[PDB]
Amino acid sequence: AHCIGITDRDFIEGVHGGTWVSATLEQDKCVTVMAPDKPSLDISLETVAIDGPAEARKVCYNAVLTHVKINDKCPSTGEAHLAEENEGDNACKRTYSDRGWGNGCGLFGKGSIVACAKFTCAKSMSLFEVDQTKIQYVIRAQLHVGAKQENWNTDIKTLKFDALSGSQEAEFTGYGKATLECQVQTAVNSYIAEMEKESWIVDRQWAQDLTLPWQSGSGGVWREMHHLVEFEPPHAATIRVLALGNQEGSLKTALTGAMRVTKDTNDNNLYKLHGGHVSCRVKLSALTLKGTSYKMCTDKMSFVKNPTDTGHGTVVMQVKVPKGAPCKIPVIVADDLTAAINKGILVTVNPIASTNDDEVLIEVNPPFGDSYIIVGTGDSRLTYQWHKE
Amino acid sequence: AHCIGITDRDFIEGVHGGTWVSATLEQDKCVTVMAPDKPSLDISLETVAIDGPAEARKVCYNAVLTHVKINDKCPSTGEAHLAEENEGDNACKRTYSDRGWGNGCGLFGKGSIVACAKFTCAKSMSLFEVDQTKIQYVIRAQLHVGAKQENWNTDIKTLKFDALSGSQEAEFTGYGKATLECQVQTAVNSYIAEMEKESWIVDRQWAQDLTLPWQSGSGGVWREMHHLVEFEPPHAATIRVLALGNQEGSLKTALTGAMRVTKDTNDNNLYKLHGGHVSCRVKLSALTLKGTSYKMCTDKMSFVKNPTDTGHGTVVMQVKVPKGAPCKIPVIVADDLTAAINKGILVTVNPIASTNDDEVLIEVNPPFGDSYIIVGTGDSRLTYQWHKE
């Protein structure tokens, strides 16, 4: 029934003697499956997530340079050295400066000069390895029984899947069961990138080709520090060493193209992916209809919710049954008030009210142009003039 | 103007003294860019294709076995051999059969037996290497000038791009030029799969992991033939060797979840993709309006095409200008027939008729509720009552 709440909807129609149907589930899309003498089935792809992905890399986009050491030697006096050159947490550069009288050198020419700086990563981007098998995907399933919207969540059977989890059964008490054989499609060489609270799906080759300092799994060592370090041309005894600007903006700019990932609120290790699609095969032969034996409702009913357009070309209404329960709710969509031929298509197959004062939510597809929605019979019946554009 | 023909449309609005705007171009979607005193610009992603991709592999899904040779030797008489065992075009199997009196062997036990069959691939699937750089993407650009639909294709400037092709200029004679800095997003490693006329974008790892005979680039050798060959348990001197069924169905089934590729009709090497998106930055400051000097149309005009809803919340109409050309077409959307305050938003900025009997197509966004569409002035002006739901 939840497809009504969802903008993008598709109707799968089953042929009378068939047992299986095929459905493609995209995220933020819903599918209503209809089969003759079978209750209509709403199936939708909730989330496609990955739980506990191992961290492959870290990419510093904001670096801080501290304790800059510069050593120099007059021309023809040898190469200048620093102990930091041996220190792994230091980014260094060896070069020469113009020396002579004016900078305390007895000889005019190129004098040795070396600069080292302590590299500290202020802000880095995490890169996670996504295992195809560890991919978990959740599918919501529900029937068109006549439950009020406020109850939808409690009637929705949640089907949990992982890569090759096998067929999942959705058992509805009083309506039998439907079976789902789902396969997640690996169409969506990829890392899970994380910057602060924001997450994306990136290409591995692209991420490795980023001109930025990167750190291996478990860390302890920064490679390619020179990507965030700037050495200006040397003066006689000094070199201006500067940390490059925060590359957060450039990174985000490059990431604008990329698919985004919602990090789970409760769990710091769960990552809900968008974009992915699921190919499902549904067995309906095990589905049945409740209240087939029920006598038709003859008592005065009323519209709790007037017939309203769903935006799906269908109409929903909420009918109250104060008396006569348990009973079948007679619903047709005729050409006029005289004719008794149903021209409409009932999504809520065999609507029933098990108890008195029950409010049954009914969805129906009226024909094009002018028609009349008729609920029940006799003088007490409910009528509502309708027009389909 | 072509966005009108396209279902999914988006309106980009430029701020008065700004020069650049950002647009995201998805396939089967259009974007209308509007800037004050600038002609509205329709931009859309036509095709994202790859030209001349090198063939990496071939995957046989339908094999044919011919000329079956079987050699055998009685127990304790040595191993049985065939010349075909060294022939690369032959799939072979070595095993033993139960031998003794009844099959012409003086000894009861396991006798050597070997079977070879000429392997011929009836039908195979091609796999192409897709170069990120060789990716070409085409963008259609057009202005809202007032051209009839039948002429749209001739007014559309085609902007050809490839990975790092640089900014492309779209020059419209009499309306200046617009500039586009586009970047294709390499979210869509990957092979290009081909079966008969049908093509798809597949994952490399998935394709390599297929339990089927495969051939290298510049082929002449088939590897893993056993995937399509069946050797039945041996009889005394014979083995029933049979080719396995056409795996076309299984392949297509697996391919249902994958992105599809349209092979170009004219070119056998061009492959148009169905999934990528393009991030574009558009410069509009160089765009100008034609007929700013034109005097307003004062002659009796007529509606060739009555104002019609586009489904985009806008209205299109086709106005004939028999006399007065060259002239400005006065168009406003007022509260009534008396008021002269334009409450509507004109998509066709400064509509003009350069020649007599010109039929100008005009699009405008009327305000909500009741309004009046007014074209021209005087007693000969055109009026059309409108309502926005």
Numbering used by the authors:
A (entry chain B), B (entry chain A): 1 to 188, 192 to 392
Sentences from the paper on this structure:
The mosquito-borne yellow fever virus (YFV) is prototypic of the Flavivirus genus, which also includes several human pathogenic viruses such as dengue virus (DENV), Zika virus (ZIKV), Japanese encephalitis virus (JEV), and tick-borne encephalitis virus (TBEV). Flaviviruses, which enter cells via receptor-mediated endocytosis, use protein E for this essential function. In infectious particles, E is primed to react to the mildly acidic pH of an endosome to undergo a fusogenic conformational change that drives the membrane fusion reaction. Protein E is a prototypic class II fusion protein, with three β-sheet-rich domains termed DI, DII, and DIII.
In the absence of pr, YFV sE remains monomeric at neutral pH but crystallizes as a head-to-tail dimer, as observed at the surface of flavivirus mature particles. We used the protein eluting in peak 5 for crystallization of the E dimer. The sE dimer structure, determined by molecular replacement and refined to a free R factor of ~27%, showed the same head-to-tail dimer conformation observed in the previously reported structure of YFV 17D sE dimer in complex with the antigen-binding fragment of the monoclonal antibody A5 (23). There are two main sE dimer interfaces, the first by the dimer axis and the second one involving the fusion loop, away from the dimer axis. The first interface involves an antiparallel interaction around helix αB, including inter-protomer hydrogen bonds, some of which involving main-chain/main-chain interactions. In the second interface, the fusion loop at the tip of DII packs against DI and DIII of the opposite protomer in the dimer for other flaviviruses. The side chain of the strictly conserved Trp101 of the fusion loop is covered by that of Lys308 of DIII, while the fusion loop main chain is partially tucked in between two short helices in DI, the N-terminal helical turn (N-helix in Fig. 6B) and a helix in the 150-loop (the 150-helix). Residues 149–155 form the 150-helix, highly exposed at the dimer surface. Superposition of DII of the YFV pr/sE complex on its counterpart on the sE dimer structure revealed a steric clash with the 150-helix, indicating that pr binding cannot take place with the 150-loop in the conformation observed in the sE dimer at neutral pH. Thus, it seems likely that the 150-loop of YFV will also adopt an alternative conformation at low pH, thereby promoting pr binding.
